[PDB]
């Protein structure tokens, strides 16, 4: 049932209790590593798409 709290809501409670303001800092530190990887793969897929268009 939807009354049962989801894992993200339980983790949200945990985070609040254990780190209200340091969550943002961890989001920033982890973001720096995620966005660089996803943008690298975005640029590789974009190159692949342009190449496949040219090869067509």
């Amino acid at each position: 049932l939807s009354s049962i709290p989801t894992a993200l809501t339980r983790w949200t409670e945990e985070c609040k209790v254990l780190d209200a303001e340091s969550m943002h800092d961890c989001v920033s530190v982890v973001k720096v590593s995620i966005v660089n990887h996803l943008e690298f793969l975005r640029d590789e897929e974009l190159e692949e798409r342009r190449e496949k268009r040219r090869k067509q």
């Binding site: 966005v35 996803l38 943008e39 793969l41 975005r42 974009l46 798409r49 342009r50 268009r53 040219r54």
Partner: protein, 61 residues
């Protein structure tokens, strides 16, 4: 995966040049798409986690 917006205009000299300006531009809208589901196998539950779960089930009775 950060999303790729559609090819704005066919043509590499002009359209793809300004498609790199748009998609890779400092100011952009990196929407997200998920990858296709990879077939995750079930994790084997450790025995201590089963002596934790079983003790509650015994507390039912």
């Amino acid at each position: 995966r950060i999303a790729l917006p559609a090819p704005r205009g066919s043509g590499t000299a002009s359209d793809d040049e300004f498609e790199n300006l748009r998609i890779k531009g400092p100011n952009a809208v990196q929407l997200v798409k998920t990858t296709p589901l990879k077939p995750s196998p079930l994790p084997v539950i450790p025995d201590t986690i089963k002596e934790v779960i079983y003790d509650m089930l015994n507390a039912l009775a």
